[PDB]
Amino acid sequence: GIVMADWLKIRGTLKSWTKLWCVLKPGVLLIYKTQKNGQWVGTVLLNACEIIERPSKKDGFCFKLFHPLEQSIWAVKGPKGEAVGSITQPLPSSYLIIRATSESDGRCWMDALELAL
């Protein structure tokens, strides 16, 4: 039931950006290390999120996914029941900052995200 799938650049508290494979389908953003034989990193539950644009210095196009009550946006278990996620740079409990490599790509993602919410 995939709606969009692409590499996206993701950051947390740290200034560092990590390029990860994200699959958008109804209700969830699924994050993997690779498109192919991906190790599951985490799943964002869109039901718990709001989305806002986040204009910035390293931009491409930049937006923010967050829990309005600053609670967890993350699914407890993997799409295949995976107990624990693959190691990445530490990501925030209650938000993701996201930029697509191209601004036009970023805009489609953001617009797409609003629907899947």
Residue numbers in the entry: 8 to 124
Question: What text does the study give?
Answer:
The oxysterol-binding protein (OSBP) and its related proteins (ORP, for OSBP-related protein) have emerged as central regulators of sterol/lipid transport at the junctions formed by ER with other organelles. ORP5 and ORP8 possess the structural features of a lipid transporter: an ER anchor (TMD), a membrane targeting pleckstrin homology (PH) domain and a lipid-binding module (ORD, for OSBP-related domain). Indeed, ORP5 and ORP8, and their yeast counterparts Osh6p and Osh7p, have recently been reported to mediate the counter transport of PtdIns(4)P/phosphatidylserine (PtdSer) between the ER and plasma membrane (PM): ORP5/8 was shown to transfer PtdSer from the ER to PM, coupled with backward transport of PtdIns(4)P from PM to the ER, resulting in its hydrolysis by the phosphatase Sac114–16.
To understand the structural principles of ER–PM tethering by ORP5/8, the structure of the ORP8 PH domain was determined by X-ray crystallography. A distinctive feature that stands out, however, is the presence of an unusually long 25 amino acid stretch forming an extended β6–β7 loop (His209–Ser236). Comparative analysis of electrostatic surface of ORP8 PH domain with Osh3p PH domain reveals a distinct positively charged cavity, representing a putative PtdInsP-binding region. The analogous surface on the Osh3p PH domain has a neutral charge suggesting that ORP5 and ORP8 PH domains may possess a distinct PtdInsP-binding mechanism. Close inspection of the distinct positively charged cavity of ORP8 PH domain shows the amino acids forming the basic patch are lined on the β1–β2 and β5–β6 loops (non-canonical mode). Structure-based sequence alignments of related PH domain containing LTPs ORP5, ORP8, OSBP, Cert, and Osh3p establish that the putative PtdInsP residues (red inverted triangles) in ORP5 and ORP8 PH domain are not conserved in OSBP, Cert, and Osh3p. Notably the side chains (green triangles) mediating canonical PtdIns(4)P interaction with OSBP, Cert, and Osh3p are missing in ORP5 and ORP8. To confirm the importance of the non-canonical basic surface for PtdInsP binding, we designed point mutations R136Q, R179Q, and R158Q, R201Q in the ORP5 and ORP8 PH domains, respectively. Both the point mutations in ORP5 and ORP8 PH domains completely abolished the binding to PtdInsPs, confirming that ORP5 and ORP8 PH domain follows a non-canonical PtdInsP-binding regime. While most PH domains (including Osh3, OSBP) utilize the canonical PtdInsP-binding regime for PM targeting, the PH domain of ORP5/8 possesses an atypical PtdInsP-binding site that does not permit PtdIns(4)P binding.
